[PDB]
Design a protein around this ligand. Structure first.
Ligand SMILES: Nc1ccn([C@@H]2O[C@H](CNC(=O)Cc3nc4ccccc4[nH]3)[C@@H](O)[C@H]2O)c(=O)n1
Ligand SMILES: [Br-]
Ligand SMILES: [Br-]
Ligand SMILES: [Br-]
Ligand SMILES: [Br-]
Ligand SMILES: [Br-]
Length: 270
């Protein structure tokens, strides 16, 4: 008690471009975030600070725990909440699950404490831990510039069936960015034209160089990719992987292949 449930949504990258290297080790990118109706369910209860999951992430490693300790640090209040996260969104899937968890929990806890932090500061608190996290404070559809944190809400003409095929391999975002060569970079002009077209519903214009690389580093991502082609759909890769998505439904043949191979198939409707 007094236990509440809060849904924590996933996202997909509807295209991603890398502009270049930052001194910061990180990279400047352009991307289109899309919130998807695919959720972790998070149970929040009054009690000793605790962040648990159903899949065995250490408490000290969990972004939500990191975020709630920084909440105490920055604001002074001591957080008495017991967090359990049921993880439907797999880590390493390129769907921003941990960053969603972080954003939605810290926003909720903040409200529950009479709003000590402002939407600008809360954005700063979650944003420092994950460039993808601030997106989950706004949700829906947004252009992510900078490293992803500089966000511009947009209306897309994209709707209808979307299917995720998540292999049972966890892609390391860092290992994928670290395989970039100068030949993978594009000018911001090229990418801005591309994002415009995707926004207008031209899904064929989606591309993502981190998916190209993810498919070399993790052959199973490439297996899923090739299998979606075989099914007669154009496949796309979310984030740095591992998720491959397409705009259509899941056949029994895909469902068979996934069951045998250990892939998760998520059918969503945008
Ligand atoms: N705009 C960005 C955003 C991120 N990055 C890279 O992502 C890295 C941050 N992301 C993660 O740590 C996500 C992640 N790491 C994993 C390792 C193993 C399995 C799953 C993982 N997810 C960061 O170190 C940086 O090199 C980057 O270069 N440019
Ligand atoms: Br619980
Ligand atoms: Br390079
Ligand atoms: Br692999
Ligand atoms: Br091949
Ligand atoms: Br793609």
């Amino acid at each position: 008690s007094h236990m509440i449930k809060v849904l924590s949504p996933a996202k997909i990258n509807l295209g991603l471009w890398v502009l270049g290297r930052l001194p910061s080790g990180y990279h400047e990118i352009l991307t289109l975030y899309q919130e998807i109706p695919f959720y972790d369910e998070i149970y929040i209860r009054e009690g000793v600070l605790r962040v648990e999951t159903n899949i065995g992430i250490p408490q000290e490693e969990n972004l939500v725990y990191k975020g709630l300790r920084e909440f105490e640090r920055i604001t002074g209040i001591e957080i008495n909440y017991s967090i359990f996260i049921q993880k439907n969104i797999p880590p390493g899937a390129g769907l921003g699950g941990g960053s969603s968890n972080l954003a939605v929990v810290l926003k909720k806890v903040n409200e529950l404490l009479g709003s000590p932090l402002s939407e600008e500061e809360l954005r700063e608190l979650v944003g420092s831990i994950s460039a993808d996290a601030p997106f989950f404070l706004l949700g829906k559809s947004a252009i992510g510039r900078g490293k992803g944190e500089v966000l511009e809400p947009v209306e897309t003409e994209i709707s209808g069936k979307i299917t995720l095929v998540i292999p049972q391999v966890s892609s390391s975002t860092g290992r994928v960015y670290s395989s970039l060569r100068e030949e993978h970079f594009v000018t911001p002009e090229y990418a801005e034209e591309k994002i415009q077209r995707i926004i207008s519903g031209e899904v064929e214009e989606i591309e993502n160089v981190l998916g190209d690389i993810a498919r070399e580093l993790y052959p199973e991502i490439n297996e899923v990719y090739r299998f979606v082609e075989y099914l007669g759909f154009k496949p796309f890769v979310s984030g740095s992987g591992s998720t491959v998505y397409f705009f259509g439904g899941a056949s029994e043949e895909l469902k068979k292949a996934a069951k045998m191979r250990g892939w998760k198939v998520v059918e969503l409707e945008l």
